[PDB]
Design a protein around this ligand. Structure first.
Ligand code: SF4
Ligand code: SF4
Ligand code: SF4
Ligand code: SF4
Ligand code: FES
Ligand code: K
Ligand code: ZN
Lengths: 48, 126, 113, 96, 208, 176, 230, 114, 95, 360
């Protein structure tokens, strides 16, 4: 997170390079975020 | 005279755009719907309804839904009197049958009959 | 006052509204003189046209004439006078004071069915 | 808001307006995404007495339309309403 | 009845009743009924032969000035022998009012077109012909406006089913879009939602 | 009550005439438009870095459908068929029968995600908060048949997204 | 003719002697709400839903049992008739269980329909409801007596039409229950008609249980061929 | 029993209108075949036109056949101008549609439809 | 509590499984048949019965407005427990 | 180079909305009105809700009325942004499309925060609104409206004084006032010819008579005057938005007639009457008394009308939708007579035409 950036860029995720046995170094996905962090990343809440 | 004389029967089957096998092979039914026995209300038995015979419904191979090929499966028409429904069916070229309206005949209701001196209409309890 | 623009597109400003309105109202009266007396259209339109003509004749200024005529600009009042004259001629031609042409059927205007 | 002062000055000169006063990019000035729970009020019919539904039934006061003329003197001519009033020019910004 | 009931307008009701009397007395040759609703709306039901005179009077009279034609509609009521009810909605900017003029026709009788009075009637009754099959005599250019180019039947009639009689699909053998008899993977389920109890006693019809 | 857009007469003195003619000959307002587009070049763009940054959303958001459970393992749906009755697109098909212990449970609960208009009437017609519209929206499929959910798919979606759906419901249930 | 004249909402109607207020109102097309009255059963007059007001009379009468005398004016839509209907509906819904989604009568319930049509829109009950122990009367009729409104159509049907006299009422006050008082199976050849005449979901069809809802079923009128009655 | 006519007072002028519409369709069939690049011959198009006229040939009401002539005129104007595509012109010929059996035995074999 | 078939197909909690001679098993060839491994009938069987000292009890599912509508359960019968019609929880009188 | 005849062929988006409305209840027919004009969602919802409330003889609570007017003005801002920017994009200027579409995304965020859907909210319902405003929404509305003045100023700087822009609009599609009245025009098309007409001023609805604003009036009937009228309508919408923010009253959001509006979820799970009413309202729906009404509002594209015919049941017998794009596309032939092809596309642009409302 970086609260000095404007609303929209103030939270981000760097995906992992291996999720469930799939190489995700270049093949990142939007559906790669678990729900407990999916609620925080989409600005539905203030608490991780 | 701006009013011509036409002595022929009213028939509009050539203008409705219905295919012929949905005209000559369909049986329209004109009837007053029965009161639902689960309820005591009689507001649904005031108007005449004309509907059609039920065609084949089969099961979808994918999800098991009910599939049909009959466009007249959900066609229910409402008429105030019987003769309007008859004229509408005869105008559209549908072979129809008519069922007479069934009304409940009046009864003789007496609260004092529950405590008769010598009749079988006494109530065993209350 | 010589208004530069009436405010409505395509509506030219009238230079002499009084003479135009008087001519139009008298023309409406002469056209309406052909309708039978018992017709209610003739009585109502004669009444309103006579009121408008008296108001126009009793006021030399235009701004207070526009204010008391209650019709916006004087040019749309002239337009309405022309439309009333056209309607009066058409109503002479149609003759709608005659009795009703045909009765409707029994349940023509019954709602709900 | 991360722009330098020189870029801000060039931006304001070329735009002609003070862009820093009204920035289109939102920052921490907006309301938080987590709010305390509310307590919404109740309506006027949430009463324990004098709350009979027959005294406030809107749908049951609807009447069938009144038939004025049906086919089964010197009265004045009647307009559908009083004539509309002339609009007044705006005192705030008449553009005149 | 203050908070949750719609307040009633009575001055507008009186004015609309007086104007309905005025119109029905000026034009007795065509006017058959005049009514004013609960929410202050004036409906004038007229004979179909007087569509042009009534509309021209309402457009051109100094006490009417109904210069705007808002909407033109047909309604399909199959139990009537004149099943189509043609509805004109007019707006008067001079008096800030609205009026409704209603007439009737069946499938085979044409109606006189009102393009010569209001110019919106062109597309409006072209759509009415397209959806209900009501012919309008003396029309400039009457064809279909919303349906498909080869469409047979008028869809807004109440004997026309919801899904039609044909459906489109692309066939590779003829390399073309073709029309076939309609078959649904899931039939449209009909719901009987009418309550068996009377809701509004004020609209109760008398028994036979 | 009204104002007169474009009713400004042009002045006919030599100052205004020379100003208009200089504006014609030297192209002043074209330079104004160029300069302001240049000023708009030197601003930070509003572009977010998808998929690493996501647009803001609300706890009321209507995405993918899910079937919830009570906090004991028992599912919440009791086969009352209100959701399929209120569905404006008829996207829900429900078939029910009493199961082994006599409970009133569904045997078939299908939602057609190609018929559904994502209106949220089903989650507000449910008396037990069984059917919900979860916060997930990235569920594009490569096949039409993958968008025809049965009961097992919806139950799996509920088990997948419970940890977020319960929090959204906890955040929003006081507004209902 | 022996007919007398009465008035329903000011409209004159000729009725036979012995006619009730309910039948006189039915003669002009007005259906007074009922919960216990059945046209093929004896008159019990205990649900008190049919309380209508006779004008120039300071008391509402039970329309299902009151005979009309001449000159009577019946006010079916007056203020105090509606007040009586609202009060009786409130008392009926005071102890009813909140089981509408899990009950087979939903969508075809008389209680739901004429609570929406004639009753109020909210509840003033701030106490706890009662619970009634369920009974077993056979594999045909599912019994949930928490939903029963004590309308006593059960006993009137089983005594006057089926002629069994197995159903009854045991208890007093709010603890009064409808049942057989023993583990007895009400097994007759006309048992499902007690499912038919129950206005609430207290008696339901066990084979039909939890299968459909009444609004989505298509109805086809046919003739039974199981015997020669037709 | 008096009704308002549409265009024809009696059957003779209605038959004249039918004749004129058939002449116009018969004239336009070669141009319709050529302009739309249809796979049919001119003879098949004229046989389809005659088949439609013969199918619609059991009517004796002047107003009904006036409406039929009006709708045929709309179709002809719709085809003279290029408003229909090739699919709308070829929709009169049911090439992809399976042949529906007509006798009792085949209908008995294939389903419950009478 | 999932169960398998002689075909090798998983059986859902509703009891559905394709027949051995059924042709509709071809849709799972090269793919998988999705079932829910958490059977609610087996899960609600593990909940202990709650013992209370009243003649009747009230159930709202827990959470108040976040549960089912509040129902009342009678506990007069001693041979059986009182199951809630919504949530499936059962109750027993202490006496 | 000169156009002699224009024949607009439509019907490529005729979905057949009215028949489907006739086959459903009122609550089910509300999203059909959501999807009619897909840039003016809450205005169409408000027109449908006003017609159904007129037929039901009920009125919404004041807070619902203020919410309705505030979101109608936000909807007007969205519609005017889309119309002006797409008009400029068709003529050839592409920068203000992105510049105002950022603010359009912000207004979509407001819609999603209040309803859960960005475009088709299904928020305004007969009886009020479905859900109350969440806490902290109006502060964001206030900040957005505070910066929107500078956004309008920058769009006007790019477009208004340009000679290339005004050369495409100064004498294009001139309409006289009487021809505008006869052809059924409404809204900005009437106002550009000098006709002083506005449905929010002449036949007002919920609390539009409690707010103060001006009405832009053109003088020449061209496309330039209509564009100026739309820009000034943006400014007046901002003014009404500020007034609605400063005058929001407390109270409930639905009508308290629980036989029309569904009860709260907390009282539905506790009270028997509320549970019965919830069941019947979400299965059968409320019954509307028999009658026909015509209710018209001032949508951003003009006079948007619903002609609703109810037979007494819970489903409408007839629902005619009167859209202004129908009449404007009808008048397009008169507009584009004696002009060029590019003038034809500019005339199409200056009529706010969404074909969802045209074909229906
Ligand atoms: S969101 Fe609306 S359309 Fe979709 S399943 Fe639910 S009720 Fe049906
Ligand atoms: S509304 Fe809820 S409980 Fe009722 S059938 Fe639908 S999901 Fe199940
Ligand atoms: S009997 Fe009627 S009121 Fe009682 S739970 Fe069943 S549907 Fe609801
Ligand atoms: S179970 Fe039903 S029929 Fe029997 S007494 Fe109770 S409410 Fe009446
Ligand atoms: S119906 Fe008369 S008291 Fe029950
Ligand atoms: K029952
Ligand atoms: Zn429980």
């Amino acid at each position: 997170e970086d609260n000095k950036q404007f609303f929209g860029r103030h939270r981000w995720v760097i995906y992992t390079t291996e999720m469930n046995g799939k190489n995700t170094f270049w093949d990142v996905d939007g559906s790669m975020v678990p729900p407990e962090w999916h609620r925080w990343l989409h600005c539905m809440t203030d608490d991780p | 005279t701006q009013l011509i004389t036409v002595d022929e029967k009213l028939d509009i089957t050539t203008l409705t755009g219905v295919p012929e096998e949905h005209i000559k092979t369909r049986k329209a039914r004109i009837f007053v719907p029965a009161r639902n026995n689960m309820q005591s209300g009689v507001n649904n038995t005031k108007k005449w309804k004309m509907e059609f015979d039920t065609r084949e419904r089969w099961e979808n191979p994918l999800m098991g839904w009910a599939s049909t090929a009959d466009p007249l499966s959900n066609l229910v028409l409402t008429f105030s009197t019987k003769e309007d429904a008859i004229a509408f069916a005869e105008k559209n070229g549908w072979s129809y049958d008519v069922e007479e309206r069934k009304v409940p005949k009046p009864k003789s209701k007496s609260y004092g009959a529950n405590f008769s001196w010598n009749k079988r209409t006494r109530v065993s309890t209350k | 006052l010589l208004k530069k623009t009436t405010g409505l597109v395509g509506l030219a400003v009238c230079e002499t509204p009084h003479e135009r309105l008087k001519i139009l109202y008298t023309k409406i009266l002469d056209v309406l003189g052909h309708i039978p007396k018992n017709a209610a259209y003739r009585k109502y339109t004669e009444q309103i046209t006579n009121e408008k003509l008296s108001i126009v004749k009793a006021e030399p200024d235009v701004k207070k004439l526009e204010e008391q005529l209650q019709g916006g600009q004087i040019e749309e009042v002239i337009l309405q006078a022309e439309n009333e004259l056209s309607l009066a001629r058409k109503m002479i031609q149609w003759k709608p004071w005659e009795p009703l042409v045909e009765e409707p059927p029994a349940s023509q205007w019954k709602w709900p069915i | 808001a991360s722009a330098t002062r020189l870029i801000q000055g060039l931006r304001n000169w070329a735009s002609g307006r003070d862009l820093q006063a009204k920035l289109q990019l939102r920052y921490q000035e907006i309301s938080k995404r987590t709010q305390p729970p509310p307590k919404l009020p109740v309506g006027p019919s949430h009463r324990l007495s004098n709350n009979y539904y027959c005294a406030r039934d809107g749908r049951r006061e609807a009447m069938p339309p009144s038939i004025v003329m049906s086919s089964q003197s010197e009265k004045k001519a009647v307009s559908p309403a009083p004539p509309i009033k002339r609009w007044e020019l705006s005192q705030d910004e008449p553009y005149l | 009845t203050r908070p949750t009931v719609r307040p009633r307008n009575d001055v507008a009701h009186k004015q609309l009743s007086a104007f309905g009397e005025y119109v029905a007395e000026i034009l007795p040759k065509y006017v058959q009924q005049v009514q004013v609703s609960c929410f202050s709306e004036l409906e004038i039901c007229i004979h179909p032969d007087g569509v042009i005179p009534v509309l021209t009077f309402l457009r051109d009279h100094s006490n009417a000035q109904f210069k705007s034609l808002a909407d033109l509609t047909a309604v399909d009521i199959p139990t009537r022998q004149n099943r189509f009810e043609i509805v004109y909605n007019l707006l008067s900017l001079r008096f800030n009012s609205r009026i409704r003029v209603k007439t009737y026709t069946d499938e085979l009788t044409p109606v006189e077109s009102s393009v010569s009075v209001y110019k919106a009637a062109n597309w409006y009754e072209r759509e009415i012909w397209d959806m209900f099959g009501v012919f309008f005599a003396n029309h400039p250019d009457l064809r279909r406006i919303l349906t498909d180019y080869g469409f047979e039947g008028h869809p807004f009639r109440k004997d026309f089913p919801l899904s039609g009689y044909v459906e489109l699909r692309y066939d590779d053998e003829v390399k073309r879009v073709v029309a076939e008899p309609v078959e649904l993977a899931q039939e449209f389920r009909k719901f009987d939602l009418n309550s068996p109890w009377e809701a509004f006693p004020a609209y109760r019809q008398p028994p036979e | 009550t009204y104002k007169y857009v474009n009713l400004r007469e042009p002045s006919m003195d030599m100052k205004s005439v020379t100003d208009r003619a200089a504006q014609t000959l030297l192209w002043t307002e074209l330079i104004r438009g160029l300069g302001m587009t240049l000023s708009y070049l030197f601003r930070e763009p509003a572009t977010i870095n998808y998929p690493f940054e996501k647009g803001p959303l609300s706890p009321r958001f209507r995405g993918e459908h899910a079937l919830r459970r009570y906090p004991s393992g028992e599912e919440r749906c009791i086969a009352c068929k209100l959701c399929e009755a209120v569905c404006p697109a008829q996207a829900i098909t429900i078939e029910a029968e009493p199961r082994a212990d006599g409970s009133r449970r569904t045997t078939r609960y299908d939602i057609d995600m190609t018929k559904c208009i994502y209106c949220g009437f089903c989650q507000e017609a449910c008396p037990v908060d069984a059917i919900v519209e979860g916060p997930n929206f990235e569920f594009s499929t490569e096949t039409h048949e993958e968008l025809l959910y049965n009961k097992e798919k919806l139950l799996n979606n509920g088990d997948k997204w419970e940890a977020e759906i319960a929090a959204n419901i906890q955040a929003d249930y006081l507004y209902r | 003719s022996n007919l007398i004249e009465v008035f329903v909402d000011g409209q004159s109607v000729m009725v036979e002697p012995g006619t009730t207020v309910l039948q006189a109102c039915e003669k002009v097309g007005m259906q007074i709400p009922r919960f216990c009255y059945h046209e093929r059963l004896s008159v019990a007059g205990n649900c008190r839903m049919c309380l209508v007001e006779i004008e120039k009379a300071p008391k509402v009468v039970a329309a299902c049992a009151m005979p009309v005398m001449k000159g009577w004016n019946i006010l079916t839509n007056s203020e105090k008739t509606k007040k009586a209907r609202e009060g009786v509906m409130e008392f009926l819904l005071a102890n009813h269980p909140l089981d509408c989604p899990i009950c087979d009568q939903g969508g075809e319930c008389d209680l739901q329909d004429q609570s929406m049509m004639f009753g109020s829109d909210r509840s003033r009950f701030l106490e706890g409801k009662r619970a009634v122990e369920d009974k077993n009367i056979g594999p045909l009729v599912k019994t949930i007596m928490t939903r029963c409104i004590q309308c006593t159509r059960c006993i009137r049907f089983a005594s006057e039409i089926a002629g069994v006299d197995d159903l009854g009422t045991t208890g007093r006050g709010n603890d009064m229950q409808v049942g057989t008082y023993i583990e007895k199976m009400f097994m007759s050849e006309l048992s499902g008609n007690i499912i038919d005449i129950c206005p609430v979901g207290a008696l339901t069809s066990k084979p039909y249980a939890f299968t459909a809802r009444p609004w989505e079923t298509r109805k086809t009128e046919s003739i039974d061929v199981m015997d020669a009655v037709g | 029993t008096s009704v308002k006519p549409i265009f024809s007072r009696d059957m003779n002028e209605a038959k004249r209108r039918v004749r004129e519409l058939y002449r116009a369709w018969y004239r336009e069939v070669p141009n319709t075949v050529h302009l739309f690049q249809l796979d049919i011959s001119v003879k098949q198009g004229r046989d389809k036109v005659r088949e439609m006229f013969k199918k619609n040939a059991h009517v004796t009401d002047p107003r009904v056949v006036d409406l039929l002539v009006i709708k045929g005129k709309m179709e002809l104007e719709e085809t003279i101008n290029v408003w229909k595509q090739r699919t709308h012109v070829m929709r009169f010929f049911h090439e992809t549609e399976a042949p529906r059996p007509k006798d009792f035995l085949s209908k008995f074999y294939v389903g419950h439809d009478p | 509590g999932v169960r398998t078939s002689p075909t090798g197909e998983k059986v859902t909690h509703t009891g559905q499984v394709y027949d051995d001679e059924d042709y509709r098993r071809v849709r799972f060839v090269g793919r998988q048949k999705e079932v829910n491994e958490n059977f609610a009938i087996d899960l609600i069987a593990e909940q202990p019965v709650s013992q209370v000292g009243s003649r009747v009890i009230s159930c709202d599912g827990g959470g108040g407005a976040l549960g089912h509508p509040r129902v009342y359960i009678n506990l007069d019968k001693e041979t059986k427990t009182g199951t809630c019609g919504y949530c499936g929880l059962q109750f027993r009188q202490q006496h | 180079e000169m156009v002699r005849k224009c024949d607009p062929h439509i019907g490529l988006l005729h979905r057949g909305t009215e028949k489907l409305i006739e086959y459903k209840t009122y609550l089910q027919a509300l999203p059909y009105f959501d999807r009619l004009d897909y840039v003016s969602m809450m205005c169409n919802e408000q027109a449908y809700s006003l017609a159904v409330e007129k037929l039901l003889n009920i009125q919404p609570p004041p807070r619902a009325q203020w919410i309705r007017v505030l979101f109608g003005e936000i909807t007007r801002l969205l519609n005017h942004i889309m119309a002006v920017t797409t008009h400029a994009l068709d003529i050839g200027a592409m920068t203000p499309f992105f510049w105002m579409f950022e603010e359009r995304e912000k207004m979509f965020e407001f819609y999603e925060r209040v309803s859960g859907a960005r475009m088709h909210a299904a928020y305004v319902r007969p009886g009020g609104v479905h859900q109350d405003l969440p806490l902290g929404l109006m502060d964001d509305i206030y900040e957005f409206s505070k910066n929107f003045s500078l956004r309008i100023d920058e769009l006007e700087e790019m477009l208004t004084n340009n000679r290339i822009w005004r050369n495409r609009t100064v004498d294009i599609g001139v309409v006289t006032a009487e021809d505008a009245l006869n052809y059924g025009f409404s809204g900005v098309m009437l106002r550009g010819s000098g006709i002083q007409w506005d449905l929010r001023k002449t036949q007002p609805y919920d609390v539009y008579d409690q707010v103060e604003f001006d009405v832009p009036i053109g003088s020449r009937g061209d496309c330039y005057d209509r564009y100026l009228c739309r820009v000034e309508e943006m400014r007046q919408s901002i003014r009404i938005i500020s007034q609605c923010l400063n005058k929001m009253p407390p109270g409930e959001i639905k009508v308290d007639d629980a036989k029309v509006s569904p009860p709260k979820r907390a009282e539905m799970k506790t009270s028997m009457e509320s549970l019965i009413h919830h069941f019947k309202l979400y299965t059968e729906g409320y019954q509307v008394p028999p009658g026909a009404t015509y209710t018209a509002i001032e949508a951003p594209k003009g006079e948007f009308g619903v002609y609703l015919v109810s037979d007494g049941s819970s489903r409408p017998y007839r629902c005619k939708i009167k859209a202004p794009g129908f009449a404007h596309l009808a008048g397009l032939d008169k507009m584009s007579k004696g002009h060029m092809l590019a003038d034809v596309v500019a005339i199409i642009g200056t009529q706010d035409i969404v074909f969802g409302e045209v074909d229906r």
